[PDB]
């Protein structure tokens, strides 16, 4: 439901890679933590 929540696991993984952000397995249990990490980085580029 969150903008980043509509991204699929495969698309989320390629996004972290573009920003060179270390990550492990993506699962609904830790998917949210990953969505927040991309938001914090993307926020910087927006500022």
């Amino acid at each position: 439901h969150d903008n980043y929540a509509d991204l699929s696991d495969t698309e989320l993984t390629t996004l972290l890679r573009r920003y060179n952000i270390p990550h492990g397995p993506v699962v609904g249990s830790t998917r949210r933590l990953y969505e927040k990490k991309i938001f914090e980085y993307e926020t910087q580029r927006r500022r």
């Binding site: 696991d9 495969t10 993984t13 990550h23 492990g24 397995p25 993506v26 699962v27 249990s29």
Partner: protein, 89 residues
Amino acid sequence: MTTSQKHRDFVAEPMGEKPVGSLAGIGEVLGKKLEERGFDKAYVVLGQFLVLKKDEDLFREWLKDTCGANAKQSRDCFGCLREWCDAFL
């Protein structure tokens, strides 16, 4: 449960850093999908089993929904990962 020698070999000695495709029930095709999901090592997959509190229904839905394993292949991973835990956890 005609599991391959890997099932007994797995629960007969530590897992070390063996590849995910080494887990019983996970074939080379399935190991590749879990690998693309961030599980390049078996001990990462055993971790998922521990996080699901051994819930067989949540584990089978997770493995099947995560790779498409059949009801049959998931049974081998449940008892294989669970028996390892029984000797090892």
